[PDB]
Swiss-Prot record:
SUPFAM superfamilies (alphabetical): omega toxin-like
Cell location: Secreted
Keyword Hydrolase among record annotations: no
Gene Ontology MF terms: sodium channel inhibitor activity; toxin activity
Protein name in UniProt: Delta-conotoxin Am2766
Free-text function comment from the UniProt entry: Delta-conotoxins bind to site 6 of voltage-gated sodium channels (Nav) and inhibit the inactivation process.
């Protein structure tokens, strides 16, 4: 789980419920 703007990978998403293709928006 991560806040929108926090680091994130494509296959490895940091947003539990947020699209993280190339960025986390949760």
């Amino acid at each position: 789980c991560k806040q929108a703007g926090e680091s994130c990978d494509i296959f490895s998403q940091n947003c539990c419920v947020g699209t993280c293709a190339f960025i986390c928006i949760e």
